[PDB]
Amino acid sequence: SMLDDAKARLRKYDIGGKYSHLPYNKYSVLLPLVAKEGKLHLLFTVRSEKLRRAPGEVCFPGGKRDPTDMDDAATALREAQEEVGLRPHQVEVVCCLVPCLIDTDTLITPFVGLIDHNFQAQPNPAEVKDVFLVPLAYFLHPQVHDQINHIFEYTNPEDGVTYQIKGMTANLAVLVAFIILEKKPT
Ligand SMILES: CC[C@@H](C(=O)Nc1ccon1)c1ccccc1
Predict the structure, then answer these.
(1) Of 92, 82, 105, which Cα lies nearest the Cα of 25?
(2) DSSP symbol at 24
(3) Residues 142, 164: contact at Cβ < 8 Å?
(4) N or C: which end of the chain has fewer CB within 10 A?
(5) Positions of the site: Important for coenzyme A binding?
(6) Which atom of ligand 1 is nearest to the CA of 57?
(7) 83 is in an annotated binding site
(8) Domain boundaries, the chain
(9) Which secondary structure element, helix H or strand E, spans residue 7, and what is its range?
(10) With a 6 A CB cut-off, is 142 part of the ligand 1 pocket?
(11) Which atom of ligand 1 is nearest the CA belonging to 128?
(12) How far is the CA of 1 from the centre of ligand 1 (A)?
């Protein structure tokens, strides 16, 4: 099936806990895969205009590890619940992808999760201004704008609203698309 095929591809890139104990400032992100209308989509947040770090930017759900978290996957799931109302029974964590090093002292660990078909996002307005889906296939043929820094522009055909996706967030979206969609019979 579509979903079994995606998880099988993803597992081949799982690094597991290999880099998890190193002495960094630690953050996790959840890359949430949603199936709709026979295709896979990624779920993105727009950060509230009132936040300290990067107000109004497009990001995946995530945040800083705290002492309660059993592991890095737990960080991602706790944060996703707080931001968009995703409960643990509503997500299957499939793997841990290559981590992102920043600022010489920070390590960000990305997890890919498959989302239940009955999940409906409840944006927490203290943290998130908006939540939206993008088809995974978009990231194979994006609409690119050069700011040089490459920026993706996605327009939602339901309402005509355009979102800008850039940086680590855009890079991780492309990676997931390549892993799942490369070399497929039509
Ligand atoms: C690790 C932090 C995460 C984030 O802050 N997620 C949030 C917060 C409110 O809404 N979405 C993120 C992911 C990707 C790029 C920048 C930041």
Answers:
(1) 105
(2) S
(3) no
(4) C
(5) 53
(6) 16
(7) yes
(8) 1-186
(9) helix 2-11
(10) no
(11) 10
(12) 31
- How far away, in angstroms, is 185 Cα from ligand 1 center? 35
Q: Could you give phi then psi for residue 135, rounded to 5 degrees?
A: -60, 135
Method used to solve the structure: X-ray
Distance (Å, rounded) from C-alpha 163 to C-alpha 51? Answer: 19
DSSP code at position 38: T
- Residue recorded with tokens 């990624």: 42
Q: Is the CB of 127 under 6 A from ligand 1?
A: yes
Among the listed residues 25, 23, 31, 17, the one whose alpha carbon sits nearest the alpha carbon of residue 179 = 31
163 bridge partner residues: 154
168 lines ligand 1 (CB under 6 A): yes
Distance from the CA of 55 to the center of ligand 1, in angstroms?
10
Round to whole Å and give the CA distance between 138 and 85.
26
Compute, in degrees rounded to 10, the torsion defined by CA atoms 66, 72, 77, 78. Answer: -10
